[PDB]
Every structure is written in C-alpha cells, then in structure tokens.
C-alpha cells in the first residue's frame, strides 16, 4: 500500500515519467511541503482541501493554492485545476463548466474567473468528498506539474541535476514565491546562485540566497520562512539527496514549531 496510496496508479506512472521520482521520494517531498503550508504532515487530507480565505481570491482549492478566483486573483489556476478532471473523467471537449457539471456545483466560468453560486458549505462540502476519487487526484498533479512542477524539473536538469532533494527544494521555492517574475522567484533566486556543476554546493549557495528573502511578506510570517528552507538544506548537509528510507530524517527535520 506504502506512500503508492496517497497517489493513484496513473498518477505515479505520471510522476515517474515526467519527474524521475517515485511514490516514497513524492511522499516525502510532499511531507515537507506540506509542514509550512498547513502544518501538517498528513497531506492527503489536502486533496480536498477548500476555503474561503478572504483572500479577494475566491476559493483556494487543493495541494498548491489554486483559487477560483476573484478581485485579487484574475488569473487563477482553478479553472485549470476543474478542466482537467473533466479531461481524466473521460470528456472529449474538456473544460471546468463541465467539471462543475459532473459535480453538480452551480457555477461556471465568467472570463478568466469561476462564478460559484452555491455557498462556502456546499462548494467545498462537493470538493472535501473528492479526497479519494483518483480522477481528481490525478488532475490535481498533472496541474501541479503545469503550474510549478515542470519548471522546477527543467530548471535541475538544465544543470544536470536530479535529484529528490533539489527537485523538491525548487518546487517549494516556485510554489511559495513563484516560478518566474521578479527577483524573489525561483527563476530569480537561481540567476544569483552561481554556477557551480557540483549539486551540493549549488544548492547550498541556492538555500543561502532563498533564506535573504524568504520571510519577506507576503511569502511566511518569521521564522516560518527561515525554518522552512533549513528543512532541505539539512537534507543536503546530511547527504540524504535521494530522499528515500529517511522517515526518520523527516521527523526530525520538520520537527519545530509553526509562528
């Protein structure tokens, strides 16, 4: 059963394919992920994750902040997130008013943004019983790897580096700050981070420029940000860049507390 269950079958063969991880190497970086973000080690549970934070966002949605939109979100990734699990579904023409049809939520797309009608407990009540429906899980990586994934892998292997560890650290640092844009993104961390072939010493010099930044707003509230990205430098530092057979390692190093 092991870590392979927190996925789906088609999205491990996914994951392997597009990534060169597997289930335990995903599980673990998700396990890091997921101990900034929401606190919490049991990520699964975030598959249905749904809220309204008062964000002017709509409602964020899943593993990696998607929102449906609103005032201060225009470009969500939301609707991308509904259209391809009418994609995995089966639909021949794909789109997010057809997964919310599937869904029977009363909503639709209006531009860029989804309109929902329906209320916060009805919305999300929908979206917290597709925790294990595979098809939504499924979709929930394959836009995860649209949106910040596929980035990161091209951005390690443009170095020549593929490692758990390093793949895991740049998804963390596009998630949390973005892929591309400014100098606070991945994209930006990584242009001052030298030129090093050596992946130790690379990522080292990466977490080094990161930790500058990291607790800015609005990325973490202090020390959330500094202790966030000590997590994967201490991975490096123990030589464990494979992330596999360290279920001790994670507990230890996810090991402080939140604010």
């Given at each position: 059963?092991?870590?392979?269950?927190?996925?789906?079958?088609?999205?491990?063969q996914?994951?392997?394919?597009?990534?060169?991880?597997?289930?335990?190497?995903?599980?673990?970086?998700?396990?890091?992920?997921?101990?900034?973000?929401?606190?919490?080690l049991?990520?699964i549970?975030?598959?249905?994750?749904?809220?309204?934070?008062?964000?002017?966002?709509g409602?964020?949605?899943?593993?990696?902040?998607?929102?449906?939109?609103?005032?201060?979100?225009?470009?969500?990734?939301?609707?991308?997130?509904?259209?391809?699990?009418?994609?995995?579904?089966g639909?021949?023409?794909?789109?997010?008013?057809?997964?919310?049809?599937?869904?029977?939520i009363?909503?639709?797309?209006?531009?860029?943004?989804?309109?929902?009608?329906?209320?916060?407990?009805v919305?999300?009540?929908?979206?917290?019983?597709?925790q294990?429906?595979?098809?939504?899980?499924?979709?929930?990586?394959?836009?995860?790897?649209?949106?910040?994934?596929?980035?990161?892998?091209?951005?390690?292997?443009?170095?020549?580096?593929?490692?758990?560890?390093t793949?895991?650290?740049?998804?963390?640092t596009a998630?949390?700050?973005?892929?591309?844009?400014?100098?606070d993104?991945?994209?930006?961390?990584?242009?001052?981070?030298?030129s090093?072939?050596?992946e130790?010493?690379?990522?080292?010099?990466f977490?080094?420029?990161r930790?500058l930044?990291?607790?800015?707003?609005?990325?973490?509230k202090?020390?959330?940000?500094?202790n966030?990205?000590?997590?994967?430098?201490?991975?490096?530092?123990?030589?464990?860049?494979?992330?596999?057979?360290?279920?001790?390692?994670i507990?230890?190093?996810?090991?402080?507390?939140?604010?």
């Amino acid at each position: 059963a092991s870590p392979d269950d927190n996925f789906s079958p088609e999205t491990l063969q996914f994951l392997r394919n597009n990534t060169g991880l597997d289930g335990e190497q995903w599980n673990n970086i998700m396990k890091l992920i997921n101990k900034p973000e929401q606190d919490d080690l049991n990520w699964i549970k975030y598959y249905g994750y749904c809220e309204d934070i008062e964000d002017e966002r709509g409602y964020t949605i899943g593993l990696f902040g998607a929102t449906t939109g609103g005032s201060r979100d225009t470009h969500p990734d939301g609707p991308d997130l509904f259209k391809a699990y009418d994609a995995a579904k089966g639909a021949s023409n794909p789109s997010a008013d057809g997964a919310l049809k599937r869904l029977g939520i009363n909503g639709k797309m209006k531009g860029s943004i989804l309109e929902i009608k329906d209320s916060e407990k009805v919305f999300c009540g929908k979206i917290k019983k597709l925790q294990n429906d595979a098809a939504w899980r499924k979709a929930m990586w394959e836009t995860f790897y649209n949106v910040y994934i596929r980035y990161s892998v091209e951005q390690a292997r443009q170095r020549g580096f593929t490692s758990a560890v390093t793949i895991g650290s740049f998804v963390d640092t596009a998630l949390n700050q973005g892929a591309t844009g400014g100098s606070d993104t991945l994209q930006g961390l990584l242009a001052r981070s030298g030129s090093s072939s050596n992946e130790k010493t690379f990522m080292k010099n990466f977490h080094a420029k990161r930790t500058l930044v990291v607790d800015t707003n609005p990325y973490n509230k202090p020390p959330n940000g500094k202790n966030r990205v000590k997590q994967w430098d201490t991975l490096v530092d123990m030589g464990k860049m494979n992330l596999k057979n360290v279920d001790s390692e994670i507990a230890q190093v996810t090991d402080w507390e939140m604010k």
